[PDB]
Design an enzyme around this catalytic site. Structure first.
Site, mmCIF file in Angstrom:
data_model
loop_
_atom_site.group_PDB
_atom_site.id
_atom_site.type_symbol
_atom_site.label_atom_id
_atom_site.label_comp_id
_atom_site.label_asym_id
_atom_site.label_seq_id
_atom_site.Cartn_x
_atom_site.Cartn_y
_atom_site.Cartn_z
ATOM 1 N N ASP A 157 0.791 -1.469 -0.516
ATOM 2 C CA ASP A 157 0.279 -0.203 -0.002
ATOM 3 C C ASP A 157 0.664 1.227 0.002
ATOM 4 O OD1 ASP A 157 -2.006 2.468 0.571
ATOM 5 O OD2 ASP A 157 -2.471 1.537 2.126
ATOM 6 N N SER A 169 -0.129 14.603 -12.647
ATOM 7 C CA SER A 169 0.150 15.366 -13.299
ATOM 8 C C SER A 169 -0.290 15.913 -14.392
ATOM 9 C CB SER A 169 -1.876 13.748 -14.054
ATOM 10 O OG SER A 169 -1.510 13.315 -15.616
HETATM 11 C C1 LIG Z 1 -11.605 -1.970 2.059
HETATM 12 C C2 LIG Z 1 -10.367 -2.364 2.739
HETATM 13 N N1 LIG Z 1 -8.857 -2.742 2.366
HETATM 14 C C3 LIG Z 1 -8.688 -4.254 1.976
HETATM 15 C C4 LIG Z 1 -9.272 -4.479 0.589
HETATM 16 C C5 LIG Z 1 -8.077 -2.100 2.753
HETATM 17 C C6 LIG Z 1 -7.222 -1.747 1.510
HETATM 18 C C7 LIG Z 1 -6.650 -0.166 1.017
HETATM 19 C C8 LIG Z 1 -6.718 0.949 1.899
HETATM 20 C C9 LIG Z 1 -6.454 1.665 1.510
HETATM 21 O O1 LIG Z 1 -6.800 3.183 1.567
HETATM 22 N N2 LIG Z 1 -5.039 2.060 0.881
HETATM 23 N N3 LIG Z 1 -4.602 3.262 0.882
HETATM 24 C C10 LIG Z 1 -8.176 0.533 2.236
HETATM 25 C C11 LIG Z 1 -8.699 -0.554 2.828
#
Ligand SMILES: CCN(CC)c1ccc(C(=O)NN)cc1
Length: 330
Positions: free
Chosen positions: A35, A199
Site C-alpha cells: 500500500d 499529472s
Molecule cells: C476495503 C479494505 N481494504 C482491503 C482491500 C483496504 C485496503 C487499502 C486501503 C487504502 O486506502 N490504502 N491506501 C483501504 C482499505
C-alpha cells in the site's frame, strides 16, 4: 541487496493485490496488500478479536524466536474508505522476495473493521508511503522500504501491477525488461506523507489532450482512479447511458457498453488506460448496470491514482534524498 516478489489480484476484478511476505523465525508467510498510500505494516494475528477473523492467515509472535514486544507501543489507523484497524506492536524479521529487514515493526491487529474481516484473502497491509504517516505511538516506526533502503543497490522500489493477471514488486533495482520506451520522472511532494505528484492532463478515448495540472497520490492500495468531477464527467459523457448514481455511490454504465480509453499525462509523456481496465462489472450479481473504474474525488479531498491507473504503467517509487516518481508504458 534487492528483492522481487509477485503480486496477485485477490479476485477477478483486481479489487486489490496480495504479495507473500515472510515474518518471523521460522518464517510465517502472510499475504499482504502492499500500500503506497499508507505507512503501517499490520497483520491479522493471534491477538485479533476472534469474531473479526474469517479465513485469514494469522501471525503468531509467540511462535517466532525473533519476535519481541515493542513495549508500550500501540497503533490505530483509518483509511479514506472508512476501513480501520488497531493493536499493539512487535519487532521481527520480515522478508519480501528475498530482501530481509531485521527489527521491522510488525503491527499486530487486536481489532479490524468488517471490510477487512470480509476480505479472507488479505492477511494485512504493508505500507510503502513515507514513514511520517506511520501511526505507532509513542515512538513512530519506519516502513519496510525505509528500513531496507540503505542496504538496497538503489533506493527505489517498483510497482508493475497486472490487469487480471499477476505482476511484480521489485526493491532495489529497475528491471529494464519490464517496460517499453523510456521512464518519465516527475516531482514528488512528501509534505502530506504520500507519493504526491502532478499529472499534466488527460484525454478521453481518441480525443484531444487537455493540458491541466492534476495533483494526486500514487496509491497501490486504492482500487480505482479518483479524479476531479469535471474530468470524470468528461469521461463518462462518452459512454451512452452512463450516469452518476447516488444510490450506488458513483458512476455506473450499461454493461453492454464498450468503454473508451483514458490517457493521463506524466510530464510530456502519456499513459493510456485501456477501456477494459475501467470496467468493474455488475453492481450486483446478474445486474446489467456496471460499476465504473473512474470516479469523482470530490469529497475525498485528494485525487487518487489507484490501481486502475497504476496497472497501465511500470511505476518507479524513487526514494532518493529528493524522492521522485517514474512512469513508463509496458
Ligand atoms: C476495503 C479494505 N481494504 C482491503 C482491500 C483496504 C485496503 C487499502 C486501503 C487504502 O486506502 N490504502 N491506501 C483501504 C482499505
Amino acid at each position: 541487496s534487492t528483492g522481487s516478489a509477485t503480486t496477485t489480484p485477490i479476485d477477478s476484478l483486481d479489487d486489490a493485490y496480495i504479495t507473500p511476505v515472510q515474518i518471523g523465525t521460522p518464517a510465517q508467510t502472510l499475504n499482504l496488500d502492499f500500500d503506497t498510500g499508507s505507512s503501517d505494516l499490520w497483520v491479522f494475528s493471534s491477538e485479533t478479536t476472534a469474531s473479526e477473523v474469517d479465513g485469514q492467515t494469522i501471525y503468531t509472535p509467540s511462535k517466532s524466536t525473533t519476535a519481541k514486544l515493542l513495549s508500550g507501543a500501540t497503533w490505530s489507523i483509518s483509511y479514506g474508505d472508512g476501513s480501520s484497524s488497531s493493536g499493539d506492536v512487535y519487532t521481527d524479521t520480515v522478508s519480501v522476495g528475498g530482501l530481509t529487514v531485521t527489527g521491522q515493526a510488525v503491527e499486530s491487529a487486536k481489532k479490524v473493521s468488517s471490510s477487512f474481516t470480509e476480505d479472507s484473502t488479505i492477511d494485512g497491509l504493508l505500507g510503502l508511503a513515507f514513514s511520517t504517516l506511520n501511526t505507532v505511538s509513542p515512538t513512530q516506526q519506519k516502513t519496510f522500504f525505509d528500513n531496507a533502503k540503505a542496504s538496497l543497490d538503489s533506493p527505489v522500489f517498483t510497482a508493475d501491477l497486472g490487469y487480471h493477471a499477476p505482476g511484480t514488486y521489485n526493491f532495489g533495482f529497475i528491471d529494464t525488461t519490464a517496460y517499453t520506451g523510456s521512464i518519465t520522472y516527475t516531482a514528488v511532494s512528501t509534505k502530506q506523507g504520500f507519493w504526491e505528484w502532478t499529472s499534466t492532463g488527460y484525454a478521453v478515448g481518441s480525443g484531444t489532450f487537455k493540458s491541466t495540472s492534476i495533483d494526486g497520490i500514487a496509491d497501490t492500495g486504492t482500487t480505482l482512479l479518483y479524479l476531479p468531477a469535471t474530468v470524470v464527467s468528461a469521461y463518462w459523457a462518452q459512454v451512452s447511458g452512463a450516469k452518476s448514481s447516488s444510490s450506488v455511490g458513483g458512476y455506473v454504465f450499461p454493461c453492454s457498453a464498450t468503454l473508451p480509453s483514458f490517457t493521463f499525462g506524466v510530464g510530456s509523456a502519456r499513459i493510456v488506460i485501456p477501456g477494459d481496465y475501467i470496467d468493474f462489472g455488475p453492481i450486483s450479481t446478474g445486474s446489467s448496470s456496471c460499476f465504473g473504474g473512474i470516479q469523482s474525488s470530490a469529497g475525498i479531498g485528494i485525487n487518487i491514482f489507484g490501481d486502475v491507473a497504476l496497472k497501465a504503467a511500470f511505476v518507479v517509487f524513487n526514494g532518493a534524498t529528493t524522492p521522485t516518481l517514474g512512469f513508463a508504458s509496458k
